[PDB]
Each structure stands twice: as C-alpha cells, then as structure tokens.
Amino acid sequence: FVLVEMVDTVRIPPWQFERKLNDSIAEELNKKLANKVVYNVGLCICLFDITKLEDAYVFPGDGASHTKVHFRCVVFHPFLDEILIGKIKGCSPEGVHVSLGFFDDILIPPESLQQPAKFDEAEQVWVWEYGEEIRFRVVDESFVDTSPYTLVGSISEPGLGLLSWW
Amino acid sequence: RITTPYMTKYERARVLGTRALQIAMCAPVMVELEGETDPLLIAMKELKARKIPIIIRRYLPDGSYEDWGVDELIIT
Amino acid sequence: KEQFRETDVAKKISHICFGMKSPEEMRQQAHIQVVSKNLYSQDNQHAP
Amino acid sequence: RCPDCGSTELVEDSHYSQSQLVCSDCGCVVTEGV
Amino acid sequence: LPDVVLKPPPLFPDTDYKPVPLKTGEGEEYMLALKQELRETMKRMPYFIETPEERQDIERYSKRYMKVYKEEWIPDWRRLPREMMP
Amino acid sequence: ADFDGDEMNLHLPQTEEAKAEALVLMGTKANLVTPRNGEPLIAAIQDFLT
Amino acid sequence: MEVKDANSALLSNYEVFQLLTDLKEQRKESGKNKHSSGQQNLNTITYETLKYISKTPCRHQSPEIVREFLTALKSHKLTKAEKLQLLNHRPVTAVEIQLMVEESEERLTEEQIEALLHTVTS
Amino acid sequence: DLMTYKGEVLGITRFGLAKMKESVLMLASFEKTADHLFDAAYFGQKDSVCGVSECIIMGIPMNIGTGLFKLLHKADRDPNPPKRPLIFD
Amino acid sequence: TEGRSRDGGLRLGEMERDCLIGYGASMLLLERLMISSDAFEVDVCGQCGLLGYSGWCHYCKSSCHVSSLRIPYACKLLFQELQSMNIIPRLKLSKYN
Amino acid sequence: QGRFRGNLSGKRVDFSGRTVISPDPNLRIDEVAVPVHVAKILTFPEKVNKANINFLRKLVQNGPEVHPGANFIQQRHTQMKRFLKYGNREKMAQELKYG
RNA sequence: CUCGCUUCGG
Ligand SMILES: Nc1ncnc2c1ncn2[C@@H]1O[C@H](COP(=O)(O)OP(=O)(O)OP(=O)(O)O)C[C@H]1O
Ligand SMILES: [Mg+2]
Ligand SMILES: [Zn+2]
User: Which residue of J has its CA nearest to H55?
Assistant: First the structure.
C-alpha cells in the first residue's frame, strides 16, 4: 500500500451542479480509478484525498464543467520484499495459486525454492510435510491494447519454519 | 479591476449560450420559470434576475487574467 | 485484474508541423505496394 | 431482418430525398444514406 | 509490352553472388580476440558512465552490503575549462 | 431586396450556443445602424414615407 | 492521467482501514442509484479490501497507538520497511521477527527481541 | 496603421500580405497555394492556429469575437480542501 | 450536394463567413461550417503526428498515443492530399486545458 | 473550386432553405414568416429537460404531419434514431426520458 | 455520378 499523486481533468455534467463540487469530484474520480491497474504503479484502490482543486472551466463544446484536480490515491504495490498473508485459491502443477483475501487472485508462487519435497500432482497437494505466508519478489506489468493480467508478481516461500503450520 | 465594468455584447451572447445549453441539459434553474419551454428565454430571465452562476475570465494579451462575476458586471 | 486505460481526452490541435517524408518513411506509412498497371480483374465481375 | 424487433419487413422507403431501408413494423431505420 | 505482376517482388531478392570468405590468419584472429577484450574491459572502465539508477523502493540494512563500489578517475581540471568541476 | 423575384437563404442553427449568439449579436433590433458611419439602415421606405 | 510519484509515501494498513470505513459509511449515507449502477466495482473493491483488513489484526489500532509504536521503534534504528511490516503483521511470536522479518543477522542481538515483542504487544 | 505598422508601406496584394502575415495556411488559401505549401514544407515552418482562417479550417472556435475570453462555473466548492493526516509519516 | 434537383443545401460563401466574422459570432460560425456540414472524428497519433485509423497508428505500429479529434472532413481531405504531395502535415496535439 | 475556397473557407450546409420573398408589413422588424412546408422540413434538435417535457410530449404525439411536432426521436442511452411516422407515437411520447 | 457547356434568374 502506497499513496500516489495524480492529476486528472474531471468533467462534471451540469445536472450535478447542485451537489458540492468536491464530493462529486471524489465520486467521479473513484468511479474512474476503481479496481484498475495503473501501469508501473499498481492496482489503485480508491481516493485518499483531493489536495489541489483549481478553477472549473466550461468549454464552448460539451457545456459541462472541466476541473483539473490534484489528488492522492491509495494503491496496492509491494516493495519487492513485503510479507503478505494470503489464502490458497487454487494450485497448478507448475505452481500454487494463492489469492489475497478477496483482494486480487493474481499471486502465483513458483515452486522452485522450497525444501526439496516440492511438487503439485494436480490433486491440489500443497507440500509434503517436513493463513499462508508470502514474500513478494518482483513487480511486473503489461499492456492490453495492441490491435485496431497486467499485474501478477512472483512470490517467495523460503524456509520460513512456520511453527504453527509446518 | 482595470477593464470595462460594462458587460460586452459578446460576453452576453456567450453567457446566454452557455447557460441555455446547460439548462437544456437538465441543469438546475434559479429563477422559477413560469411556463417557459424555451431554454434561451429561461437563460435571459436568469440574466435579468442576475442569478447566472457563471464567472467570466477576461484574459489580457500578455497572459494575465481577471475574473468578473455576471452579477458584478453592468448590463444594458 | 483490469488495466486502467483512458477512454477519451479532450485533445485540441495546437499547431501543424509541416515537413517532408524520406523514401523509407513512405514505405513505413504505406500499407501495400502497387505494382499492377491494370485496375479490374478479367472476369465479368470486374473486381479491383 | 430488423435489428430491434427481429422482423423481416424491411422496406426501402426514401423520405424527402433520403434513401432509407427501414423496418416496416417498429420503424427502426436499418440503413440510411447513399 | 511488359507483363503484369500479381504479387509484389520478394522482400529480399536472391543474389547469385555471395560474399567473399573472410581473411584468415593468426593476425586476424588476434584482432578479433583483442576487440572482444576491449569490449569486455572498457565497459568496466570508469570512463564508461552508466545511467544513474533511481527510485529506490526502500532503504535496508542490506544496502551497505549491496552498495556498488567503484574507483573513480579524477579529471585534470588544469586543462579542462572551469565550468565542469562538480 | 426588391421583391422582384429575389431569392433569399434561410439557415437554422442546430445549437443553443449558436442560437443565442445569433439572437444577441445579429438581432435585427441590435443592428439598426450600419457600422460604416452609424447611420440607421432599418427605417421607413416608399409607401411609408409617402 | 499521469502520476507525479508512485512511491510518494508508504502507509500502514490502519490508515487504509480507517479510510475504507469512512468511505463505506459515507457511501451508505449518500447512496445514489445512477452512480452506483454506473460503476459497482468501487463497492466490490472497498468491501472486499475492508473484509481482508478486518481478517488481519489491524483492528484496535489508533493514531496514538501508531505514534507510540513509531516513537518506541525510533530508538532501534530499524528501517521504515521493517517497522511498517511489524505494524501491519503485529507479531506476537518471536519467530516472526527472528526469521520472516528480513535483515535478521546482527540486528536481533538476542536481547532487543524481547523489547520489540513487549513494544508490539503494548 | 495596418499598412504602416512594420515601418514600410505594405500593400494588400499577395506580396504585402505575405510580408505581413505569418500563418502558412492563410497564405496558401489566399493565393499561390502550391508555392506557399511547398516552401513551408521545405522550411519546416510550424504554423500555429492563432489566426481566424486557420481556426475556421481546423474547425475550432476562433479567438476573436465571443472566443476571446473563457467562462468559469460558479460552483459551490472549496479550493485547497483539508487533507487527511498521515499517521505513519 | 449543390443543386435543388439533387436535393442540395445552401452555401455559406466566403462573404457570408466574412460577415459572420465581423459579427464576432465564433460559436455560430463553428456550428455552421463544422458541426452542420462536414463534422468528422479522426484518430491522430500524438507521437508521429500522422492520421491513424480505429484507434491505431500503422506508422508507429502502436496504439498508446492515438487520440480522437473532431475536424471538418474537408480538412482531412486536404491533409491526405498534402501527404500524397509529400507535404507532410504533422499535428502536435495538446489537451484543451 | 479548390479545397481552400470551395470546401474549406466556404462550404455547403444542410438545415437550410432558399425561397422567393414577398412583403408583409404586419410582422415586426425582428420577425420573418416561414412557410409551413419549409418548417416541416427544417428541424431543430431540442433536448428533453424538466421544463419542456410536457411540450415535447405533445409535439411527439402530433407526429411528422401536423405542423407543431417532430420528425425524429434520438434516445439518450442508445443513439438509434426513431422515425416518428412509424410505430406507436403515444407510447414513444409516454417513454420520453430526460436527455 | 463526375465533368464541361449553354441558357436563365437576381
Ligand atoms: N451580378 C450581380 N451581382 C450581385 N447582385 C446582383 C447581380 N445581378 C442582380 N443583382 C441584384 O439585383 C439588384 C440589382 O437591381 P438594380 O440594378 O438596383 O435595379 P435595376 O435592375 O437597374 O432596375 P431598373 O432597371 O432600375 O428598373 C441588386 C442585386 O442584389
Ligand atoms: Mg431584385
Ligand atoms: Zn504514430
């Protein structure tokens, strides 16, 4: 989790003019930046606050109100070493599929670093024994449009010990 | 505060046009229309009542600006 | 999950930069190379 | 077929110099302009 | 009259002449080895200025262990004009 | 115009802004005097002067 | 739509929890049919992230508690990431600090661990 | 004043108009379209859209007339709103 | 089209445009000469300055910088003719703000 | 007849008419008399708001034949035009949404 | 349809 500074041109239609400007600006910005992954930034969650809000122009076209807004928004972006606690929402032979709790089913830990009793035999067998911990390793993002996902991340499961659960 | 206190005819035309366009697009009305189905007549009534929520931003050629409220300006 | 891509921006043309195109740039811009001097096919449909 | 009501009553009716293929049941303008 | 062509000519038309085989000998191979050595050694030379990495995620106790250390040559400012001292 | 068969054109603006600009700037009541010397152009004519 | 800084300031899960609770109560106080029908993914992300944070021990936190914890840890010369992870995870067992928490070597001192556990439990 | 603002009496012909105005598109539209366009392409002259004729051609509102100023909406607002304090920093 | 026999519309000649300019009615001039006659929406690549299609620039082989832009259709025809004449008009777009 | 003078500086437009004129002294100097036939052809797009809904309903009910009326309806959500000569005009008038 | 040419109207 980290705060991100953004500047956006928000267009408010005239039928919301009776509303206070800041509230409707926040509502529209949240509607525009919810459950979406900003490239090289991470998955934005919601708006934290609106720091700078300058004058509201009205253009000779649409007739709505366009405002340039400086705001801070919270996003989920680990720092390549953060420790997380997710739940196993699936498992593939080449690697388990852990999902952060109802947050994002994008964490795919490779099984190439645990103690040498590692394999997934397609029966959802996690690990041959000697709340699931995670150490984020690398961030990666990709584009979508290429003709007339985007955050997965790699996960480390070292010899953490895990006295409570193997 | 240095420009003309009188509201120019071009300013009136553009303010009325923008206000009528907003009213035609379901913007709130501030003068309690009496059977006026024409947005432009409603905009003219708002201008006469000096209730138009629009601020003109007069731009000087160098780049400097100054803001005048519609109620602050003088109409003819 | 979903990538944030901006739908539409109120872009306004600022200025037009006139210039010229090199022969390489013409090939890059073009889609096909025209080599046939005739227009329509031989058949009676006369498709291009 | 009409894209709205699914009918096949597509009539070519020009209205004041505007060629127009329109559904004859619900009036949906399928195609216009030549 | 010239014939009409249905498909554009191939992107790389073939040639019946091929490049002459390269010169061989102890000297030429020494040149190749020396050039590869220059490539390998002049990237580590301090004259090869690397792009400054930026935007460190966090500070860590391991930074001191992973701190990149490299000797830096000191320019002779007597010959160089005054404007280029840091 | 002289009503001797002269044809006149008539345009209908399709925008509220354009309609308001036309009514304000180009209203007949707003252009009673020519800009050349300020003389009134819209005035009484034959069979009204008489 | 450009971002000025993607790493402006790291924040703990308590700030996110407080912000999500405030947003949830404001939204339930100002529920709009058209706005909600336009985008429901806001409700999904807020509700599910709030549930996930609630499953974590992030409850029972206050700004005074966070300030006291930060001041207590400021004498241990630990990095910002370490104290952030300790605050988010709330380690009750020593082994969480000993092994899972990075920079373990030469930092635990085998005596500062007890003080760290006392502070995190306080 | 327009004829004598550059220090020399310039006529309203194409030569004087070329010496007075700077926008490529208006010069091309008035007279000698091909020559003006080819010379502009050769010089790489970037032409802005300040003038009226280029505004008309580009389909944008012209700067003169009602387009000189900009309008602002007197919306109920509060610039520089209070910021939520940061606890961890 | 031109004539009544072909159901054509009336023509705003150069002097009509001059009179509209003299009035200063910018919005009505824009509506008459752009919105009501030959309004069109093209896709311009903000990187190369050339015209793309369907939100895609073939010249740059990319779609990140392609932006929609309103324009008279006659202006698009002029731009394409100039491109065919090797007089390449490159448009440097910007936000309306 | 080039692009600049024939299609860029001055170009043909729709929503326009051209008619012979005749005098009429009983009209104010700011008014012009338009034939009924031309008015049935030249249309104005009026946006449905809270003020003219009861007026546009009657205009839609009249249809494209009676002079006070409309020729097309463009829906707010879908941009599919509806020709008023076909379909139940009363239902369309009853289903006039804002915008 | 495109283009030209004429004859009109004003
Ligand atoms: N070539 C043209 N260019 C512009 N306007 C024209 C042209 N031919 C006719 N008109 C229109 O017709 C009008 C000319 O009429 P005018 O010359 O004043 O009277 P007239 O035709 O001499 O009639 P009398 O012979 O005096 O009875 C004015 C103008 O708007
Ligand atoms: Mg006459
Ligand atoms: Zn491009």
Answer: J9
Residue A90 belongs to domain with CATH number: 2.40.50.140
CA distance E53 to E63: 14
Helix (H) or strand (E) holding G49: helix G41-55
Please state the domain count of chain A: 2
Kindly state whether residue A62 falls inside one of the protein's structural domains: yes
Q: What is the DSSP letter of I32?
A: I
Question: Is A81 at the interface with chain E, CB within 8 A?
Answer: yes
Based on the fold, state whether residues A60 and A104 are members of the same structural domain: no
With an 8 Å Cβ cutoff, is I72 touching chain C? no
Q: Residue-wise over J6-36: b if at least 16 C-beta within 10 A, else e?
A: ebbbbbbbebbbeeebeeeeeeeeeeeeeee
Which of A24, A41, A76 lies at the terminal end of a domain, its last residue? A76
Phi, psi (degrees; rounded to nearest 5) at G85: -65, -40
Q: Cβ H65–I30 below 8 Å, yes or no?
A: no
Find the angle CA(G51)-CA(G54)-CA(G60) to the nearest 5 degrees. Answer: 155
Query: Is residue A48 one of the residues assigned to a domain?
Result: yes
Sort residue A25 into left (φ over 0), alpha (ψ -120 to 50) or beta: alpha
Resolution of the structure in the document, Å:
3.0
Which residue range forms the structural domain that includes residue A26?
Answer: 2-76
Of A76, A105, A127, the last residue of a domain is: A76
The alpha carbon torsion through H4, H5, H7, H9 (nearest 10 deg) reads -20
User: Measured between beta carbons, which residues in chain I are less than 8 angstroms from residue A148?
Assistant: 53-56, 63
First-residue to last-residue Cα distance in chain H:
64
Question: Residue A163: inside a domain, yes or no?
Answer: no
Residues of J in contact with I33 (CB under 8 A): 11, 13
Do A103 and A88 share a structural domain?
yes
Cα–Cα distance, B9 to C31 (Å, whole number): 52
In this complex, do I10 and F11 lie within 8 Å of one another by their Cβ atoms?
yes
The CA distance from H28 to the nearest CA of chain I, in Å, is 12
Query: Do A71 and A117 belong together in one domain?
Result: no
How buried is residue J87: exposed, middle or buried, by Cβ count under 10 Å (0-12/13-18/19+)?
Answer: middle
Identify the experimental approach: cryo-EM
Q: Ligand 1: distance of its center to the CA of F46 in Å?
A: 18
